[PDB]
Amino acid sequence: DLADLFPGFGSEWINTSSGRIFARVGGDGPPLLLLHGFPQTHVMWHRVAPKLAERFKVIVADLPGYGWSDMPESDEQHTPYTKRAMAKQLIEAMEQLGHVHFALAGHDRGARVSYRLALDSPGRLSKLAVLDILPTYEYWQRMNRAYALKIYHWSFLAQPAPLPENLLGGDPDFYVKAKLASWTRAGDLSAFDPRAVEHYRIAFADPMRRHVMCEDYRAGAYADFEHDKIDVEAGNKIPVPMLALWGASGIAQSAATPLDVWRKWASDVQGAPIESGHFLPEEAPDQTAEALVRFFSA
Amino acid sequence: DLADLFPGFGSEWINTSSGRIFARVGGDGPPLLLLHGFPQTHVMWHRVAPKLAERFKVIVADLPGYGWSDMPESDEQHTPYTKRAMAKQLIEAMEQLGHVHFALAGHDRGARVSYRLALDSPGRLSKLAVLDILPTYEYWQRMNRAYALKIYHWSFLAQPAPLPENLLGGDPDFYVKAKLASWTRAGDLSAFDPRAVEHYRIAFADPMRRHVMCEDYRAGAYADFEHDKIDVEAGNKIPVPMLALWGASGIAQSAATPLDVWRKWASDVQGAPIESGHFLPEEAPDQTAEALVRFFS
Ligand SMILES: [Cl-]
Ligand SMILES: [Cl-]
């Protein structure tokens, strides 16, 4: 079956009004919520989370609809898979554990939940880290020929159902491995623990999990963009101290210099590149863990 | 099996140095070459070609690599599927028939061959008509969120092999029907003759034909864009009289006001909207045929 990649961590199914959140929980200390993105699950943190668990109570959650979390039924506006809704559902989940103020690090889609959480509900966060993203608004505003070729999946996966779902279902293994490999520094699967790849492949093998991922990308092209547009045009900035980490060969640094962009969105932001492709916690786990431990311990 | 949608047209395999071009030929009078696009074949003209063959020798060709035309081997720059190379191949095809000066109408990819041909070899054309396109340069320069979502296949099908080939193989019958339906005004397949859909569906079922289509879109993102950019930067304009027709619900009108764009590209252009989605000759065959005969005659 599927390997346990978090030796010593407990497992929790947290009930919320939108379905259960699955999480691994370990460590002790101030609470720290870790959110994955696409096409992964909470196991992508397995190389970094033990180092964090030395200092923090580490909650490694599957996003709503991902991994082993429940999949709320979507609707015409992709509501449960908007980052606004995911953020609210994770706030509820954390409250079930007694965590009403916590630290948060997210990667990829999870990072988008994270900065939206900080915009909507900043009082819930002590500190925020985002890994290898710019805000959704900024990717769309910078969508020229070169970038449309680089992140074509932003507009492919956002096509109306069931178009991407039907194409993905012919050979799901190929696509999940293709995306994992294409966004790494090396362009192959060598950075990943094969036991982790199996987790990602098995999640992607479920047609309803694939649909959820497309709903996430549809939200990303519509409501998420519109929520971000409101904030940027209103000049609303994230007031929580934040860390922006990005991969020197990752996605965010394509088509913008990341710290300059985040300075427009956040009043107190620091950042650093890491020699890595998109998948910082797996491609560069020691470097990522150190940056996060330093930031959240300050 | 496949219906003959061009009663009284002959069927020719035209040899060129890059492979054979399939065409239906009918009519008499001045020569007029009609070029289809994606994901179709020459049969998309079946409702309009008979009206044109009243006045013209109508040659209804499958693009290089499409339909029953041969598929030249591609290379790392997608050369045979660049519009420049497709245009040269079709010029050679027409010379085989003794046509060195001819009228030309194209739709979708075939219209991209056509305006590239008009830029490269304008002495070959008496008149040019392009259906529901803007130049490739213009699509890419207008790339924004709205357009990226609308013409997502421009960046999806240009991804390196074998990504789009493998995904298209996931459900090819669904994909080709989805493209046909989604770009019509009706949003379904009711605008199409079912026998024509069978033609499109059967060509799309061949993986090698699907690969060529991706090669076409790869050329469309790279060399075709570069070739257009040179002409824009040099201020080169199409000197052939041209007609730009577009669908009121079609693709070209999403990016811009099509006649204002074409006036930047052509010194003598007229144009009009047709009450139609993208597939003008099938969604609106009478309006399309009328406009073509009036312009070409
Ligand atoms: Cl992302
Ligand atoms: Cl086109």
Curated annotation (Swiss-Prot), chain B:
InterPro entries xrefs: AB_hydrolase_1, AB_hydrolase_fold, Epox_hydrolase-like
Phenotypic consequence of H153N: Reduced catalytic rate with fluoroacetate, but increased catalytic rate with chloroacetate. Minor effect on substrate affinity
Location of the AB hydrolase-1 domain: 30-268
EC number: 3.8.1.3
Effect of D108N: Loss of enzyme activity
Enzyme class: hydrolase
Full protein name: Fluoroacetate dehalogenase
GO-annotated molecular function: haloacetate dehalogenase activity
Coiled-coil positions: none
Keyword Transmembrane applies: no
SUPFAM superfamilies named in the record: alpha/beta-Hydrolases
Superkingdom as given in the UniProt entry: Bacteria
Assembly behavior: Homodimer.
Site feature: Important for enzyme activity: D132
Function: Catalyzes the hydrolytic defluorination of fluoroacetate to produce glycolate. Has lower activity towards chloroacetate and bromoacetate.
Active site: D108, H278
Protein family (similarity comment): Belongs to the AB hydrolase superfamily. Epoxide hydrolase family.
Residues given in the record as fluoroacetate binding sites: R109, R112, H153, W154, Y217
Organism per entry: Rhodopseudomonas palustris (strain ATCC BAA-98 / CGA009)
Span of the signal peptide: none
